[PDB]
């Protein structure tokens, strides 16, 4: 049966300005089946107030979701996404690079 | 607005 | 310009762990306006765009009723398709449906559609004439035959030429502020140094609507399509989108490269240079 591997993007909604309010995005796309585990992480640790968009899909039937949460960048805090999926042997992790 | 109206594959 | 309204339905079977998970989302163009979630509390069709919230309880009730009928139709299809494919009852399986309508700049019907998938691959599809079907395989010929005797094309064509485009139009005016806007890409370029003799050159497009956009790098007027890194257009989270493209320049040749943006919101294609 069909199985596709998620593409993973971690970025800020607005340009990241230290001390200002912003949103941390993790946009996984192009996956199938829809069952997927996505976490946003602050310094290796898991965030709790994370929301996601409704499950939709593309031309090729592969699903996409956007995970996000309100955050304020700082000079020291690291942020990342941890995505698990059946096409992934171990959970994949992608750090947030502001620059880029 | 979505479809009515019935169906059934 | 041209516009579209589309509905996406997703039905996943979680055997012996409840009923099938049903999810519906609705979009005008690139803007999502409604949603149903078989797990959600409300159990109603809910609004997800501010310009659709006060449409009345009669719109919200009729819409809730229909998507509850979609729910119960797709529950039945999941079981029927297990049959069609001699699949075990313990297996998780997926059904996806997509339908909607387009218009031109005249806001009159342009084309309609109604595709269907199972386990991530095309099952059956309403042909562009909206009168015939296109089964992807053996098990889908039965279903094709079924809809031919039920006259389902006639019913779809009915909704696609009328109620569909007709409401696409009501919404376009209801949220004409969101739906007839055009945000042109806000562009810039960055420069990072991979090593000493190499440098990453990245062109950015931020805060544009709609999602449709082109970003191309060049060297001396030569397209670097094969040497560029493009990324998928992505939701910023506020109704706008983002996208970048990067090339690698041998430290010093920066002036050789230029980035080109194309968007329906730009009067003229922007050309960025590093100078």
- β content of chain C, as a range? 35-45%
Give the neighbour order of strands across the main sheet of chain C.
4-3-2-1-5-6-7
What is the percent of helical residues of chain B?
Answer: under 10%
Structural class estimated from helices and strands of chain B: little secondary structure
The CATH topology label of the largest domain in chain C is Murine Class I Major Histocompatibility Complex, H2-DB, Chain A, domain 1
Largest sheet of chain C: 7 strands, antiparallel
Largest sheet of chain B: none
Q: Number of helical runs of chain C?
A: 4
Oligomer: heterotrimer
Radius of gyration of chain C: 23 Å
Determine the fraction of residues in helical runs of chain C and give it as a percent range: 10-25%
Give the ordered list of helices and strands of chain C. EEEEHEEEHHHEEEEEEEEE
3D shape of chain C: globular
Please write out the topology.
The complex is a heterotrimer of chains A (100), B (9) and C (275).
Chain A: E1 7-12, E2 22-31, E3 37-42, E4 45-46, E5 51-52, E6 56-57, E7 63-71, E8 79-84, E9 92-95
Antiparallel strand pairs in A: 1-2, 2-7, 3-4, 3-8, 5-7, 6-7, 8-9
Chain B: no helix or strand
Chain C: E1 3-12, E2 21-28, E3 31-37, E4 46-47, H1 57-84, E5 94-103, E6 109-118, E7 121-125, H2 139-150, H3 152-174, H4 176-179, E8 186-192, E9 198-208, E10 214-219, E11 222-223, E12 229-230, E13 234-235, E14 241-250, E15 257-262, E16 270-273
Antiparallel strand pairs in C: 1-2, 1-5, 2-3, 3-4, 5-6, 6-7, 8-9, 9-14, 10-11, 10-15, 12-14, 13-14, 15-16
Keywords (chain A): Amyloid, Amyloidosis, Disease variant, Disulfide bond, Glycation, Glycoprotein, Immunity, Immunoglobulin domain, MHC I, Pyrrolidone carboxylic acid, Secreted, Signal
Subcellular location (chain A): Secreted; Cell surface
Modified residues (Pyrrolidone carboxylic acid) (chain A): 3
């Amino acid at each position: 049966m069909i199985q596709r591997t998620p593409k993973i993007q971690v970025y800020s909604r607005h340009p990241a300005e230290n001390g200002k309010s912003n949103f941390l995005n993790c946009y996984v796309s192009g996956f199938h089946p829809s069952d997927i585990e996505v976490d946003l992480l602050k310094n290796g640790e898991r965030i709790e107030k994370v929301e996601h968009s409704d499950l939709s899909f593309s031309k090729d039937w592969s699903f996409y979701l956007l995970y996000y949460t309100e955050f304020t960048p700082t000079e020291k805090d690291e942020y990342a996404c941890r995505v698990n999926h059946v096409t992934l042997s171990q959970p994949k992790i992608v750090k947030w690079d502001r620059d880029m | 607005m979505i479809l009515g109206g019935v169906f059934x594959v | 310009g041209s516009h579209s309204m589309r509905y996406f339905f997703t039905s996943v079977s979680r055997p012996g762990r409840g009923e099938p998970r049903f999810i519906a989302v609705g979009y005008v163009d690139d803007t999502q306006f409604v949603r149903f979630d078989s797990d959600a509390a409300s159990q109603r069709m809910e609004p997800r765009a501010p310009w659709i919230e006060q449409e009345g309880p009669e719109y919200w009730d009729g819409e809730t009723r229909k998507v509850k009928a979609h729910s119960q139709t797709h529950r039945v299809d999941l079981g029927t398709l297990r049959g069609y494919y001699n699949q075990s009852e313990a297996g998780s399986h997926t059904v996806q449906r997509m339908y909607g309508c387009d218009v031109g700049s005249d806001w009159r019907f342009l084309r309609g559609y109604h595709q269907y998938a199972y386990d991530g691959k095309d099952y059956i599809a309403l042909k562009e004439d909206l009168r015939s079907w296109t089964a992807a395989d053996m098990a889908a010929q039965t279903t094709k035959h079924k809809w031919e005797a039920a006259h389902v094309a006639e019913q779809l064509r009915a909704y696609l030429e009328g109620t569909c485009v007709e409401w696409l139009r009501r919404y376009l005016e209801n949220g004409k502020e969101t739906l007839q806007r055009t945000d042109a890409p806000k562009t810039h370029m960055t420069h990072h140094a991979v090593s000493d003799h190499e440098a990453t050159l990245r062109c950015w497009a931020l805060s544009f609507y709609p999602a449709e956009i082109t970003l191309t790098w060049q060297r001396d007027g030569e397209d670097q399509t094969q040497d560029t890194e493009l990324v998928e257009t992505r939701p910023a989270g506020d109704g706008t989108f983002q996208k970048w493209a990067a090339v690698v320049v041998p430290s010093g040749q920066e002036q050789r490269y230029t980035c080109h943006v194309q968007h329906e919101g730009l009067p003229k294609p922007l050309t960025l240079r590093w100078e």
